[PDB]
Design a protein around this nucleic acid. Structure first.
Lengths: 52, 73, 155, 105, 76, 50
RNA sequence: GCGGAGACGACGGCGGGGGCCCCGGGCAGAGUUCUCUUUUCUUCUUAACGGUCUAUCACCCUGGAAACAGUUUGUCUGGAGAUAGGGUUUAAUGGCCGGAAGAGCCCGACACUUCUGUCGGGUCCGGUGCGCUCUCGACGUCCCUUGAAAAUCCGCGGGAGGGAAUAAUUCUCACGCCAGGUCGUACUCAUAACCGCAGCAGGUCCCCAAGGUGAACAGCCUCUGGUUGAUAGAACAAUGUAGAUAAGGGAAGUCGGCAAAAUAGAUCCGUAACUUCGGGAAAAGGAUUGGCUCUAAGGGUUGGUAACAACCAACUUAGAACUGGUACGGACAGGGGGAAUCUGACUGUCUAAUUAAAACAUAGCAUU
RNA sequence: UGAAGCCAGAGGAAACUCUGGUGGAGGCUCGCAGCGGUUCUGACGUGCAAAUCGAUCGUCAAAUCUGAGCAUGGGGGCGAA
């Protein structure tokens, strides 16, 4: 979780309050990163992640 | 009545048909036209994201069985 | 039209069993369009899905039988199936009787009707099964008082 | 001595000539039982009409609005109005009679 | 959750920088008003009877701290 | 069971990723001899042996 | 250095608490309504965590007990200090408050294509127990049986070092600040998700466990919650498998009363030989059992020989009249009994898949 | 069903005896589950089953039933044999 939040902060400049992680049945790790209330997840997903 | 096996549905849960109610009142001998039962009887980023949610549940994104072949024939 | 998913979701939403879920048979296509719990809740609010009431289990016969047994009916030898001790234990009867007698003796000693030596010997008589009930103990105390008063008047 | 007041509001069916208020009042007079016996009202329960298809009850005993609603449903069953008329409490001690919901077919 | 029995201590609790939020709950069936302040560790509840003291406390509270009245239904 | 080790879960993940039919573009290759997945596994038929 | 916690068997009755079950009133809703039924049913809930007040043992002070007393269902305690009076303390799944009514639940009126709802009214007061389940406490019983360890946490004995003058502190107090990585988490757990070659009538470890009858987690019927899945339609021959009845006789049947029938619950009368005196024994043989209407006994609290009245509560037991009858443990459930012989002391154990026994073991005894 | 221990009453110089209670012992007993596997011209016999099904039966507070971890390995082990 520490590496995940560091990677998000250094690459995409994203601040997170907490991160929950699981490992999927196919063998890859999935991270739910909750963002700080000042930043908007919809705005970040539209601009940086391109998830619109 | 079938109260041994199951309870009766309450009368407030079933919409009473106007034809049947008018027929029953006509049996009881009242003027339904004088009371008018017809009047009483009833009868952007966020948008793109919502569309993406709807399409995501409706249609699978990939098809590993058939993405390697294109063309109908 | 298959409505198994809708019946399961409606049971979860209404907080009942699936056998208490009622789906409107004249609205099957509109119920089939409901794939989410929000849509099921909307149909519940519209009244297309309702929770059926519980089937009757009345206690009226049990209560009348209880009143009859209280006033004394159905207590005969043809009605009894367990032994007398299995029905009412002698140990329970004895414990109740001993507690009643000891409570009465404590009350009389506290009020001052009997003194401490008389209390002690009556306690041991009650433990030795002289008195079968409170009236018997009271009458024994009264006859002992009469004998003591006669002895005092003679002396 | 405490006094309780009850209103049975049959204004809409009484105006619609569905509900007979005088017959309902007679039914209440012959069916309200005091101490487990009918015809024992006296000065404890008074039943009257305040007009506009409404029946008013003064009680000095512990007479229940649930009992009044039960007797009203019994009268509707006797008059073949149980499947069509509903007794709904609207205030403290006020029960109105109204039609069930009707759909255009 | 902790109960404050007295309005002045409620006021310096609201004056403290840990005081995150503040709300007013009215119970008309019981005839009482609860003032609640949410801080870092605890939620403090002050219970008052129906008086002028509740409305006077409402302006006597710090103005930077947001004071909100509790609605009848807690919507999510 | 629900309680499982990381090694077990990793090998089950590999088995889940292997459990698929062959892609349909495989059969159109020149000189192709693969007609189906001959190592297909099912949870009721053959055990993984873990 | 010393000590405490972690940290400990089985079984029996008794008491406290929670939950469930039961009864009454009230609000709201529902169902029944030929007739009766102020009716029958449904919601009426309150978490972790805190504050405060309480909760048996145990211990302390005074005092000195035989005419021995206190006291348990169960006989223990007391000049090694009882009763009594006065106190200190461990123990909450107890009361009130905060959480918290704003939640959850029930009902209602409008609005409502969806989007959405919007606004009201409630969520109250008691009682009962040889009930069921869990938990806690004080007791008691049994052993040629005496029923884990460690991590970890705390207390004490000791007295080493140590002082502060624009602050010292070797304070387990309050508030304030920061942080909590890895891996598992779906679903089945079985008449279809496991093993038996299978979607196999087999086998495979646990937790929760409602109402009625009844002694009863027996059998039978019902609620919640689940199912309605096991190739189907028609006909009703023989012979089968399963379930039954049969006049008169009553073991004449058969190697052999095999199988079936008969007995059976409870209350009461009564019960032989033999015996290791514990048993035999439910020996044997008899009387009875429904319904209804009553009567009597068995408790608690309050009130001034009160040795009396009132009120409250629930289940047992005995007695009597009346009444239907072919039946009354009316289904269900549920010993046939007896006279002897051989044999092994008994309880127990084994030939998984043909032998459960006079075999094996056992305690007792004897020898090396 | 009712062993020790205990209480009361009646005797007995006492030791003891009798009567009525209390108490809750036992590799005790009827019996639900569980465990086992007695009997039946039983069912089944290319079965539902390479040992199953029905009724009946034994035992049921312990020499009872049972999970997991661990130990004993073929000239062996284990064996109420």
């Amino acid at each position: 979780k520490a590496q995940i939040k560091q990677a998000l902060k250094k690459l995409y400049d994203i601040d997170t309050v907490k991160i929950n992680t699981l490992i999927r049945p196919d063998g890859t790790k999935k991270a739910f990163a909750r963002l700080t209330p000042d930043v908007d997840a919809l705005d970040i997903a539209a601009t940086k992640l391109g998830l619109v | 009545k079938s109260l041994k096996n199951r309870a009766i549905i309450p009368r407030k849960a079933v919409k009473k048909p106007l034809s049947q109610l008018e027929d029953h009142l006509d049996q009881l001998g009242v003027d339904t036209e004088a009371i008018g039962l017809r009047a009483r009887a009833q009868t952007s980023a966020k948008e793109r994201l919502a569309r993406s949610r709807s399409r995501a549940r409706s249609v699978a994104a990939t098809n590993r069985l058939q993405d390697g072949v294109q063309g109908t024939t | 039209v298959n409505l198994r998913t809708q019946k399961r979701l409606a049971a979860s939403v209404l907080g009942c069993g699936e056998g208490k879920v009622w789906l409107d048979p004249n609205e099957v296509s509109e119920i089939s369009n409901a794939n989410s719990r929000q849509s099921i809740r909307k149909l519940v609010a519209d009244g297309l899905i309702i929770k059926k009431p519980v089937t009757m289990h009345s206690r009226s016969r049990a209560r009348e039988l209880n009143l009859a047994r209280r006033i004394g009916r159905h207590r005969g030898f043809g009605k009894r199936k367990g032994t007398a001790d299995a029905r009412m234990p002698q140990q329970v009867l004895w414990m109740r009787r001993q507690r009643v007698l000891r409570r009465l003796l404590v009350k009389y000693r506290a009020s001052g009707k009997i003194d401490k030596h008389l209390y002690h010997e009556l306690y041991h008589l009650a433990k030795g099964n002289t008195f079968k009930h409170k009236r018997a103990l009271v009458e024994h105390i009264h006859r002992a008082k009469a004998e003591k008063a006669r002895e005092r008047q003679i002396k | 001595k405490v006094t309780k007041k009850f209103i049975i509001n049959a204004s809409q069916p009484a105006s619609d000539k569905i509900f007979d208020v005088s017959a309902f009042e007679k039914f209440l007079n012959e069916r309200i039982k005091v101490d487990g016996r009918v015809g024992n009202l006296g000065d404890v329960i008074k039943i009257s009409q305040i007009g506009d298809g409404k029946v008013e009850i003064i009680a000095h005993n512990d007479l229940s609005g649930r009992y009044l609603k039960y007797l009203t449903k019994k009268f509707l069953k006797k008059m073949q109005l149980r499947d069509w008329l509903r007794v709904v409490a609207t205030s403290k001690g006020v029960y109105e009679l109204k039609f069930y919901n009707i759909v255009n077919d | 959750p902790q109960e404050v029995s007295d309005i002045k201590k409620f006021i310096e609790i609201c004056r403290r920088k840990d005081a995150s939020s503040a709300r007013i709950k009215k119970n008309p069936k019981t005839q009482q008003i609860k003032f609640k302040v949410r801080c870092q560790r605890f939620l403090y509840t002050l219970v008052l009877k129906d008086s002028d003291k509740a409305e006077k406390l409402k302006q006597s509270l710090p103005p930077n701290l947001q004071i909100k009245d509790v609605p009848k239904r807690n919507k999510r | 069971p629900s309680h499982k080790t990381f090694r077990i879960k990793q090998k089950l993940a590999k088995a889940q990723k292997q459990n698929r039919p062959i892609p349909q573009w495989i059969r159109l290759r020149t000189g192709n001899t693969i007609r189906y997945n001959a190592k297909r596994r099912h949870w009721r038929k053959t055990r993984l042996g873990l």
